[PDB]
Structure 1
Amino acid sequence: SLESINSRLQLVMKSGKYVLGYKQSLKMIRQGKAKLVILANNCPALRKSEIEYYAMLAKTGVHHYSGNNIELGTACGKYYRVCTLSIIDPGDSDIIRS
């Protein structure tokens, strides 16, 4: 179910609120606003274990995206690369349900 999680993110970019980037997503986890965090496979290992530990305390689900930041940013419909994506509200999407 990888062709799905692309199509779910495309529905979050339209409907939902989200935070692309690490520094900005680290602040949404910390303020208990992030309901899902999505990491690229090639994020720094110290920042994978940073996000995984902040989401431990905030009790947020951490997804690990199939591809890299160039591939993650494409699924977020952006023309730049993103290693950390925190979703505030899914809007009208089924990303946190499944």
Structure 2
Amino acid sequence: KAKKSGENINNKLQLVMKSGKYTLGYKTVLKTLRSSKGKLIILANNCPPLRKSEIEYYAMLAKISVHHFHGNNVDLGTACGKYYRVCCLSILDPGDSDIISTTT
């Protein structure tokens, strides 16, 4: 009121990694926004200052929904010897998932 929720995020994007359209990275996202192709924009919590405000304006100008997370690695594996990190992701693609629906 629940037991850990917690991180149904983590497993949610976990699938995307194998399922598929979508794009990662700042530039490509800013591009997706301007092109108006993006559907949703997920931003990592820490994410740099004014580096986030950018994605914010163009998300506004492009009328793109912004779901504040973010980003990282399959933490457990790359932790050990493993992440790459991601400060933002752009749903031009979710497939067998549903993070798009009622969640940001």
Which bin holds the TM-score, normalised by the shorter protein? 0.7 to 0.9
CA–CA separation in structure 1 for the residues paired with 2:61 and 2:6: 28
TM-score, normalised to structure 2's length?
0.76
* Pair 60,41 (structure 1): closer, same or farther in 2 beyond 3 Å: same
**What SS is found at the alignment partner of 2:100?**
coil
Task: Provide the alpha-carbon RMSD of the alignment.
Answer: 2.2
How much does 1:75 deviate?
5.1
Report what 1:52 is aligned to. Answer: 56
Which of the two has greater helix per residue?
1
Q: What displacement does 1:3 show?
A: 1.8
Change (3 A) 1:38 1:75: farther
Comparing both chains, which one has the higher relative contact order based on Cα–Cα distances under 8 Å and sequence gaps of 6 or more? 1
Q: Which has the larger radius of gyration?
A: 2
Listed as ranges, the gaps of 5+ residues in structure 2 are none
Q: Identity of paired residues, percent? A: 70
Q: Scaled by the length of structure 1, what TM-score is found?
A: 0.79
Mapped pair 1:5 → 2:5 = no
- 1:74 corresponds to: 73
Unaligned regions of 5+ residues in structure 1, if any? none
The count of residues paired between Structure 1 and Structure 2 equals 93
CA–CA distance in 2 between the matches of 1:63 and 1:53? 14
- Do 1:38 and 1:64's aligned partners in 2 also have CA atoms closer than 8 Å? yes
Question: How far apart in 1 are the matches of 2:28 and 2:87?
Answer: 12
